[PDB]
Amino acid sequence: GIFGAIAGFIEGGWTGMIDGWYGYHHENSQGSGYAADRESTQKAIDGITNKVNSIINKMNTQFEAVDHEFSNLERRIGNLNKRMEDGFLDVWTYNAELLVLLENERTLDLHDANVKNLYEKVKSQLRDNANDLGNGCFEFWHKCDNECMESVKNGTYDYPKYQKESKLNRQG
Amino acid sequence: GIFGAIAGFIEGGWTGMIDGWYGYHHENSQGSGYAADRESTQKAIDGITNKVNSIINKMNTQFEAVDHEFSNLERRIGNLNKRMEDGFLDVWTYNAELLVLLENERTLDLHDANVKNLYEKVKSQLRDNANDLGNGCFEFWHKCDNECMESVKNGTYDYPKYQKESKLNRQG
Amino acid sequence: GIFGAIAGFIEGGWTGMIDGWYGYHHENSQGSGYAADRESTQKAIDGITNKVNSIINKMNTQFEAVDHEFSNLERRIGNLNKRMEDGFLDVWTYNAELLVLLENERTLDLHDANVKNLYEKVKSQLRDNANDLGNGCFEFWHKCDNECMESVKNGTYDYPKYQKESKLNRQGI
Amino acid sequence: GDKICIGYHANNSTTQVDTLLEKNVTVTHSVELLENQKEKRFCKIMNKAPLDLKDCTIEGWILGNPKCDLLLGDQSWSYIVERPNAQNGICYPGVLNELEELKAFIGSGERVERFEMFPKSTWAGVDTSRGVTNACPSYTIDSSFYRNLVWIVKTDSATYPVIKGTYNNTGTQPILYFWGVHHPLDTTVQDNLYGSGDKYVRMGTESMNFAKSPEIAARPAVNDQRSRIDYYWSVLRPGETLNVESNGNLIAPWYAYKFVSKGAVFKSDLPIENCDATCQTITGVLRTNKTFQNVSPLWIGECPKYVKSESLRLATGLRNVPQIAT
Amino acid sequence: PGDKICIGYHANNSTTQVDTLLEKNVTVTHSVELLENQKEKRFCKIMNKAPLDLKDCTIEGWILGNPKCDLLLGDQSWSYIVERPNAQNGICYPGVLNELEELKAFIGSGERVERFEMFPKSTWAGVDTSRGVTNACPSYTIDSSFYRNLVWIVKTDSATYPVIKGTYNNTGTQPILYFWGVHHPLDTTVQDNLYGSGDKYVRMGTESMNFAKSPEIAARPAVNDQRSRIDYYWSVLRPGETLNVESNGNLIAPWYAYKFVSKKGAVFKSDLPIENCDATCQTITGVLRTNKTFQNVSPLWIGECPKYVKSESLRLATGLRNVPQ
Amino acid sequence: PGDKICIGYHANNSTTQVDTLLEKNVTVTHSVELLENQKEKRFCKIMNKAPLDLKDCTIEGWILGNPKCDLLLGDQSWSYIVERPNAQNGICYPGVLNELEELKAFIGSGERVERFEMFPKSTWAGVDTSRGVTNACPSYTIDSSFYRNLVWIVKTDSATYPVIKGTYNNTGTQPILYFWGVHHPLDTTVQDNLYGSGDKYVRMGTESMNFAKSPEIAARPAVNDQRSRIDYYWSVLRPGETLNVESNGNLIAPWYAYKFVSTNKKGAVFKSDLPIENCDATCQTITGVLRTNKTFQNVSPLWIGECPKYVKSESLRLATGLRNVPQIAT
Ligand SMILES: CC(=O)N[C@@H]1[C@@H](O)[C@H](O[C@@H]2O[C@H](CO[C@]3(C(=O)O)C[C@H](O)[C@@H](NC(C)=O)[C@H]([C@H](O)[C@H](O)CO)O3)[C@H](O)[C@H](O)[C@H]2O)[C@@H](CO)O[C@H]1O
Ligand SMILES: *[C@@H]1O[C@H](CO)[C@@H](O)[C@H](O)[C@H]1NC(C)=O
Ligand SMILES: *[C@@H]1O[C@H](CO)[C@@H](O)[C@H](O)[C@H]1NC(C)=O
Ligand SMILES: *[C@@H]1O[C@H](CO)[C@@H](O)[C@H](O)[C@H]1NC(C)=O
Ligand SMILES: *[C@@H]1O[C@H](CO)[C@@H](O)[C@H](O)[C@H]1NC(C)=O
Ligand SMILES: *[C@@H]1O[C@H](CO)[C@@H](O)[C@H](O)[C@H]1NC(C)=O
């Protein structure tokens, strides 16, 4: 996809993650699971809702065709009216169809970026205290607590706190 | 924001950086301060100016309403003219308002990409002679002089020059 | 460019890479050459071809001007015809020209993205078994023959296999 | 060791969107913006019924064709429904002049009140009661005439004298009214019905002038008539006065309409039912909250935008890539 | 403790906002408003040329030569026309000016007219030219008068009304706009006293135009105490065309006409003042003095004006999202 | 030297540029021009149907049967009509063809006409058919002639122009396009000379149409050495309809008329001097043939057949490839 994460370096989505668009999967000696990242999920929902509403708002004017009759000496103006009405029909059909194709492209990109950006946020916190497996997964070189997992998710991860444990594990 | 830097992992802007859109904040024993990255800032100004000027140029034509009069036997053509002029009014009002919403979204993303690309530019110079903190800031593992900061801003930073000093403290 | 790779941290293109949009250049004791990344090139070709055909398809209606004559008591309706036909001409000229400027910007960005992602794909396989030279180039800290090169291009690069060799060499410098 | 992974939502959606880059992309969430469904009937708009013209055309109604007596009094409408196969219109052959502007003026209205504009006693010294024809039967009388007009003819006595009438619109509403000019097929009918000598119909208001004389000739038979009537209509503005003056061949205004002023005339088969709508198209009712519709460009009320599209589905969620289960 | 270098972006004191597809009310460091919503409520010169103020006259009153429109009378050049809504001097003798809307359109297309005598009164032999006045058409100095551009030809004291004839060959560069009429008496009595007995006609023709009309006698409702009417007519004699006039009686003769010279023309119906100022873009509701691309002032204008849209604001972000501390 | 792998992109010798919202004149490796600016300056056949070349005749001259237009006389079939801007042979006896614009509009939208005698000269009784000729309307062969589709009827040596009547009933499946006229003498003298004395009329009716006109006698400026005029008229007699003609005098009677077939194509009337050649086209504009795959064209808004959309643009080139940054060589 253009940021390379969705159906990219993260090969598939998670049906078990049901409470948001973007998220974390963790596995602990205390258990495992799928938890949405609420902030990026909600920001995305507000943005996408706004986009939908803006489009609806912008599209809320109508051209109105009319039922007028024309006589057998009014071929020119009758045809003028037809070409005019068909003309606006073609312009609005074009506007709506193109807009949908373009906005869908860009909406999928936005989702892809939001996933990419979460992944980058974790990678910079962990540094060499974790090993990058593929598929957007990190394996810690140290024991990672539920409390430690939450710190990674909320951006407070203490890299010094586990540096020595990690190094000893890393090249043991 | 889509590239994740502006209002993102770089949480706030700098009222102190007056002479550019994007740039650097340094701190060292000699002081602290701000410096715009002249090249990316100018390249952005150039692109943004071109966009603004393209939009104005494409919007240069005008549809002209006329206010001809119509008799009490010209209700149909009178109404035809009205619907015609209101139809073009609605199409241009739509074109202009949607284009502004779309282009504003993309311009904000452009700025976001430029900041991110600047961050990655520095990151790749510094390598492990510095620590990447979460926030777009790098803490040096060596002493970085005003000359040294300039070399970073310049793209001429010398990694081998400081590699041994950095290792000492990176493990010291 | 928006993703910063094309005309960016990778300064120039390769005229020697003839079989794809995006690719690898390699050099080892065995030899040197260019090779396109087939998968990313073909996905871009499909995507761009779809874009072109979608534009052509959405633009495939025509406003029709007409040859009708008007008399010296038909100034108003003659002018109504004129302002109407010109009105649709101006709308469609605007649509086409604006669309082309916008899609050209976005098409160039898409290419920039595909290069950057290809670079990040390699970078993350190689870890510290290789050194970043500038300009999107990696020098391996170990011997990398043709099968090793291909594994990088394939996505199958074996970092543990070479981690001891590259660590020893990385020290000695 | 312990894992933490980053990823995205998937679900069992099989709903697809198209993109500039790609077609048939399954997404987790999406919204269809277009309505393609309609109720094939006519309903009330603003809790106001439409006027069903039934077996009558607009001409047959508003001139008062004897077979349209069902429609005869006052009428209030939200829109007009004219049936394509309506057979009662202009019964005595001839042209209703400026037909199309008449039809556009009537469609602009929401109400009319029928009233006697010129009582038969207006016209001195002529016969007000013989003006019927086999071309205009009612359902019970073989020879009749339009309810809104009087076909004046000369008295048993030899001469048709100058007749005159005035109506002053002291009302607050415009008046839609009608008259005509009889064109006999030969000079023998002209002399029987009207006196010898050049005949004229003249009318004027503050802003209008009308003058016409009989164009005597035999036209192909239509409802057994080789003669013709030229029909006319006008609108008497509030404060305006109408003078009428003729010495023959006048089909006089009798009854007219106080007229009250977006409207529509739908030519359609569809039934009018005891139902309410906010959006009525010529091919049926839209009962929707969608932004676009491909049903019809012709409507009344508050409708979504007409486009030729089959579907306008917006991605809202992300590319759906659910794990494969065997 | 270590030295630091940080990558960052501009912020400032801006509280100027834009909307995007994704988000409303986003404060941004720099932006440009593309729409103009302000105007000078007055009429100015366009291209250094003054407009024509019709004052108390309608367009009809002006070019027919209504006696109370004399201040207008003679030669005019204009960048656009201003007709005042309550103007009272128009068609003074009741009647219809045929193809009026189309006349208004042709006049609107013009930039200048030169008034001249097309048919001197001596053109018509055997008839009275000095008596064609009415209390329906007073000037400011006489109770009974007539249009300056027309002659109401009447019977001589004796001999009835003869066939009268006139011609005019347009040798000029310019088209000629001219006017005439047919009088329609309320009575056969008025008909007989003014014109002869006998069937009357008014006939006109050029290389490309034919006109024929005879009177239609009836009492119309009284307007300006007149129950009679005039049918007024206008036409345009092309360069090189000749006009032939022939009448039995009931002719209201062309007397003076206009050499007419023909861009975008404007007849503004407005009460706004005309001031000694000068402008590039004149709207029916005022002057736009602006470099902006769009305007929400009016769709009706002359000059080089920005595009009309119904929008209240069209502000383009140029700077970034403003996030000051 | 250490083993290298580099990531990069294609470049080539392309010098073709595009514009974007952010940047003008970007050289790219691959692109598509979407707009066609090339045309063949000629008229071609459209549904394998040749257009009608009116040559030195106008549309009026043609369907009235101007004697100098006999080249076009008879049945005609066409995909469109080409009328030369300086054709000389139109209305030869001066006067107006009433509702002309709407007739020209009706004739475009036709694909074929069959000429036929509608009213034989015998139809009119007690009048002279054969004196109806003028100096204004020469044929190429004869100095004095008249339109092939009309009879200028004149009173015989007998003082009286009688009442004449004519009927034509359309039992056909096709509408009939037909013409008539009313002659306006310069003189009451010429009026007396040609027709009866007293009040004259031309009355015509169908089941849906009426017409009545009397002569309007006056001297007009000389055209084609004529101070008199003819009012010309046209109408369309629908399938199943009957026409009645009745006249006192001053009738220019319908003689030949046209069975008319309306078309399922646009169709078009082009005013132009371009050559018509033995060629086929899919897209015919008024200034030429487009033979193209492109989406847009800047040649003309006026056309018949399937043409690309008209825009004012000079070029509409879409980038498909990437920014082209070839190695500088020296
Ligand atoms: C009948 C005739 O010849 N009488 C003499 C007039 O012709 C002549 O006036 C001149 O008329 C000239 C036109 O002559 C034709 C014509 O070609 O237009 C001759 C035609 O045979 C005649 N046809 C019919 C059916 O009448 C035709 C027609 O009458 C007119 O068009 C109706 O106006 O006229 C030409 O216009 C000359 O400019 C004109 O002087 C007069 C004067 O010498 O004498 C008559 O004896
Ligand atoms: C770059 O930095 C050096 C010090 O590092 C300084 O003297 C020089 O002027 C700077 N100039 C550039 C690279 O533009
Ligand atoms: C026209 O032809 C049909 C068939 O002969 C006939 O029934 C009809 O009466 C004709 N019209 C007239 C007026 O005779
Ligand atoms: C905002 O900034 C401008 C330029 O710095 C300054 O001139 C102005 O005084 C400031 N506005 C306020 C907050 O008054
Ligand atoms: C009018 O004058 C012009 C030039 O003097 C002349 O050529 C033309 O014949 C005249 N028109 C007529 C028919 O009198
Ligand atoms: C290229 O640039 C020239 C001027 O540099 C300009 O005239 C032309 O329009 C531009 N066109 C393209 C797309 O090359």
With helix as H, strand as E and coil as C, how does chain E read? CCCEEEEEEECCCCCCEECCCCCCCEEECCEEECEECCCECCEEEECCECCEECCCECHHHHHHCCHHHCCCCCEEECCCEEECCCCCECCCCCEEECCHHHHHHHHHHCCEEEEEECCCHHHCCCCECCCCCECCCCCCCCCCECCCCEEECECCCCCCCCCEEEEEECCCCCCEEEEEEEEECCCHHHHHHHCCCCCCCEEEECCCCEEEECCCCCCCCCECCECCEEEEEEEEECCCCEEEEEECCCEEEECEEEEEECCCCCEEECCCCEEEEEECEEECCEECCCCCCEECCCCCEEECCCEECCCCCCEEECCCECCCC
Residue whose tokens read 């289960």: D325
Question: Under 8 Å CB-to-CB from A157, ≥6 apart: which residues?
Answer: A125, A126, A148, A151
Confirm or reject CATH 3.90.20.10 for domain A1-172, answering yes or no.
yes
Phi/psi of residue B19, nearest 5 degrees? -100, 15
Query: Is residue F223 within 6 Å of ligand 1 at its C-beta?
Result: no
Which domains are present in chain D? Answer: 1-42+274-326 (2.10.77.10), 43-273 (3.90.209.20)
Structural domain boundaries of chain B?
1-172
What 3-state DSSP class applies to D16?
A: strand
**Single-letter code of the amino acid located at E119:** F
Alpha-carbon Rg of chain D, whole angstroms? 30
Stated as kind and residue range, the H or E segment containing C146 is: helix C146-154
Closest ligand to Cα F225: 1
Cβ proximity of F224 and F93 under 8 Å: yes
Query: Is residue F242 within 6 Å of ligand 3 at its C-beta?
Result: yes
CA of F164 relative to ligand 1 center, distance in Å: 24
Cβ proximity of D284 and D38 under 8 Å: yes
- Distance separating alpha carbons of residues C101 and C129, to the nearest angstrom: 43
CA of F223 relative to ligand 1 center, distance in Å: 13
- Residues facing residue E260 across a β-bridge: E113
User: What tokens were used for F244?
Assistant: 């009645």
- Distance separating alpha carbons of residues F142 and F67, to the nearest angstrom: 9
Cβ proximity of A92 and A63 under 8 Å: yes
Region of E240 (left: φ > 0; alpha: ψ -120 to 50; beta: rest) is left
Alpha-carbon Rg of chain C, whole angstroms? 27
Question: Under 8 Å CB-to-CB from E209, ≥6 apart: which residues?
Answer: E235
Question: How many C-beta neighbours within 10 Å does residue C161 have?
Answer: 13
- Distance separating alpha carbons of residues D59 and F27, to the nearest angstrom: 68
User: What tokens were used for D17?
Assistant: 């969107």
Query: Is residue F25 within 6 Å of ligand 6 at its C-beta?
Result: yes
B154 Cβ under 8 Å from any chain F Cβ: no
Q: Which chains touch E (3 or more CB pairs under 8 A)?
A: A, B, C, D, F
Mutate which of B154, B158, B159, B162 to test ligand 2's pocket (most atoms within 8 Å of Cβ)?
B154
- Distance separating alpha carbons of residues F280 and F51, to the nearest angstrom: 11
User: Which residue in chain C is spatially nearest to F302 when comparing CA positions?
Assistant: C65
Q: What is the resolution of this structure in A?
A: 2.0
- Distance separating alpha carbons of residues D145 and D135, to the nearest angstrom: 8
Stated as kind and residue range, the H or E segment containing F319 is: strand F317-319
Number of separate helices (H) and strands (E) present in chain E: 3, 28
Question: Under 8 Å CB-to-CB from F330, ≥6 apart: which residues?
Answer: none
Query: Is residue B103 within 6 Å of ligand 2 at its C-beta?
Result: no
- Distance separating alpha carbons of residues C134 and C144, to the nearest angstrom: 19
Of B11, B81, B84, B117, which to mutate for an interface test with A (greatest number of A Cβ within 10 Å)?
B84
CA of E205 relative to ligand 1 center, distance in Å: 19
Question: How many C-beta neighbours within 10 Å does residue D162 have?
Answer: 12
- Distance separating alpha carbons of residues D269 and D283, to the nearest angstrom: 9
Query: What are the strands, taking DSSP E only, across D184-294?
Result: 201-204, 209-212, 228-236, 241-246, 250-253, 255-260, 265-267, 272-277, 279-281, 284-285, 292-293
D1 Cβ under 8 Å from any chain F Cβ: no
User: What tokens were used for E279?
Assistant: 């402008």
- Distance separating alpha carbons of residues D246 and D241, to the nearest angstrom: 17
CB contact under 8 A, F236 and A72: yes
User: Which residue in chain F is spatially nearest to A77 when comparing CA positions?
Assistant: F102
Cβ proximity of F237 and F245 under 8 Å: no
Interface A:C, Cβ pairs < 8 A: 49
**Single-letter code of the amino acid located at D127:** D
Cβ proximity of E313 and B101 under 8 Å: no
* Chain F residues in contact with A74 (beta carbon < 8 A): 102
What 3-state DSSP class applies to E98?
A: coil
F23 Cβ under 8 Å from any chain B Cβ: yes
User: What tokens were used for F257?
Assistant: 């008329």
Cβ proximity of F113 and F107 under 8 Å: no
- Distance separating alpha carbons of residues E31 and E14, to the nearest angstrom: 10
Residue whose tokens read 């590039």: E280
Cβ proximity of D137 and D68 under 8 Å: no
> At CA C85, angle to CA D102 and CA C58, rounded to 5?
110
Cβ proximity of F283 and F292 under 8 Å: yes
Alpha carbon A33 to its chain's center: 21
Instruction: Locate the ligand 6 atom nearest the alpha carbon of residue F18 and give its number.
Output: 13
Question: Under 8 Å CB-to-CB from E238, ≥6 apart: which residues?
Answer: E170, E175, E206, E208
Alpha carbon A23 to its chain's center: 12
**Single-letter code of the amino acid located at D118:** F
* Chain E residues in contact with C75 (beta carbon < 8 A): 102, 105-106, 109
Strands F251-254 and D163-168: unpaired
Number of separate helices (H) and strands (E) present in chain C: 4, 4
CA of F284 relative to ligand 3 center, distance in Å: 44
Nearest to D133 by CA among D48, D226, D19, D45: D226
CATH for the stretch C1-173: 3.90.20.10
- Distance separating alpha carbons of residues B147 and D6, to the nearest angstrom: 40
Cβ proximity of E238 and C72 under 8 Å: no
User: What single-letter DSSP state applies at residue D323?
Assistant: P
Strands D313-315 and D30-32: antiparallel
Alpha carbon D71 to its chain's center: 13
CB contact under 8 A, D7 and A140: no
Cβ proximity of E291 and E206 under 8 Å: no
- Distance separating alpha carbons of residues E84 and E284, to the nearest angstrom: 12
**Single-letter code of the amino acid located at B152:** V
Query: Is residue B154 within 6 Å of ligand 2 at its C-beta?
Result: yes
Question: How many C-beta neighbours within 10 Å does residue F306 have?
Answer: 11
- Distance separating alpha carbons of residues B62 and B58, to the nearest angstrom: 11
CB contact under 8 A, C47 and D23: no
C157 Cβ under 8 Å from any chain F Cβ: no
Closest ligand to Cα F206: 3
Residue whose tokens read 């030429």: F288
Closest chain A C-alpha to B59 CA, distance in angstroms: 17
> At CA D215, angle to CA D211 and CA D217, rounded to 5?
170
Question: Under 8 Å CB-to-CB from B167, ≥6 apart: which residues?
Answer: B141
Query: Is residue F222 within 6 Å of ligand 5 at its C-beta?
Result: yes
Question: How many C-beta neighbours within 10 Å does residue E219 have?
Answer: 17
User: What tokens were used for E189?
Assistant: 């009595």
Handedness of CA F67, F72, F76, F78 (dihedral sign): negative
Helices marked H in chain C: 38-58, 75-126, 146-154, 159-172
- Distance separating alpha carbons of residues B10 and F323, to the nearest angstrom: 30
Stated as kind and residue range, the H or E segment containing E252 is: strand E251-254
Query: Is residue F169 within 6 Å of ligand 3 at its C-beta?
Result: yes
Closest chain E C-alpha to D125 CA, distance in angstroms: 19
